[PDB]
């Protein structure tokens, strides 16, 4: 059977922490002219298109331009966030 | 705000599912996973009547 929907209100960022952290890393890499600046830029681009909350860096593996290394970084940063 | 019928993702061809997911920044996944993800996205972004 066909399901009918009405689009919901323009939602705030579903992933404010990941956006913040990728932005911080992007800015740090840009300031230092580091080769990894593009990694963070590309990840931010795909993350901003994604409408669902992510529970972990591991879950974020489904996103374009989210490599194993970056997903691990997000997992590690998440641990630090709730530890502190 | 108009009525949007949810596409029948379960009968979509694999290449089309991939293109739909690309809109949301999502990489190609196993077919069942893609169908479930697109349904999840639709239900989060639309209120069912």
Separation between Cα atoms, residue B25 and residue A71, nearest integer Å:
15
B39 in a structural domain = yes
> What Cα–Cα distance (Å) separates residue A15 from each residue in A21, A33, A50, A54, B5?
10, 26, 9, 7, 27
B5 in a structural domain = no
Backbone angles phi, psi at A62, to 5 degrees: -75, -10
Of B3, B25, B44, which has the smallest distance from its Cβ to A46's Cβ?
B25
Domain count, chain B: 1
Per the entry, the structure determination technique was X-ray
Backbone angles phi, psi at A7, to 5 degrees: -55, 140
Please tell me the number of Cα atoms within 13 Å of A18 on its side-chain side: 28
Q: What's the gap between Cα B3 and its chain centre?
A: 16
Separation between Cα atoms, residue B24 and residue A50, nearest integer Å:
5
B3 in a structural domain = no
Is B25 within 8 Å of A45 when comparing Cβ atoms?
yes
Q: Are strands B3-5 and B46-48 parallel, antiparallel or unpaired?
A: unpaired
B20 in a structural domain = yes
Tokens 């691990």: give the residue.
Answer: A72
For residue B31, the enclosing domain spans 11-45
In sequence order, the β-bridge partners of residue A6 are: B3, B47
**What domains are defined for chain A?**
16-83 (1.10.150.110)
On the 0-12 / 13-18 / 19+ scale of CB atoms within 10 A, B6 is middle
B6 in a structural domain = no
DSSP A58: T
CB atoms under 10 Å from CB of B41, counted, come to 19
Cβ pair A15, A59 in contact under 8 A: no
At how many degrees (to 10) do helices A16-31 and A37-47 cross? 150
Give the pair of three-digit tokens for residue A35.
């080769």
Separation between Cα atoms, residue B37 and residue B28, nearest integer Å:
11
The answer, for B8 touching chain A at a CB cutoff of 8 Å, is yes
Nearest to A74 by CA among A40, A49, A51: A40
| Structural resolution in Å | 1.8
């Amino acid at each position: 059977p066909v399901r009918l929907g009405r689009k919901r209100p323009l939602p705030a960022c579903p992933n404010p922490l990941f956006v913040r952290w990728l932005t911080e890393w992007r800015d740090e890499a840009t300031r230092s002219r580091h080769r990894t600046r593009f990694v963070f830029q590309k990840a931010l681009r795909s993350l901003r298109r994604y409408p669902l909350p992510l529970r972990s860096g591991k879950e974020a593996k489904i996103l374009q331009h989210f490599g194993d290394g970056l997903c691990r970084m997000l997992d590690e940063r998440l641990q630090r966030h709730r530890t502190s | 705000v108009p009525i949007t019928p949810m596409p029948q993702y379960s009968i979509m061809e694999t290449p089309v599912l991939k293109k739909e997911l690309d809109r949301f920044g999502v990489r190609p996944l196993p077919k069942r996973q893609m169908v479930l993800k697109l349904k999840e996205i639709f239900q989060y972004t639309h209120q069912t009547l």
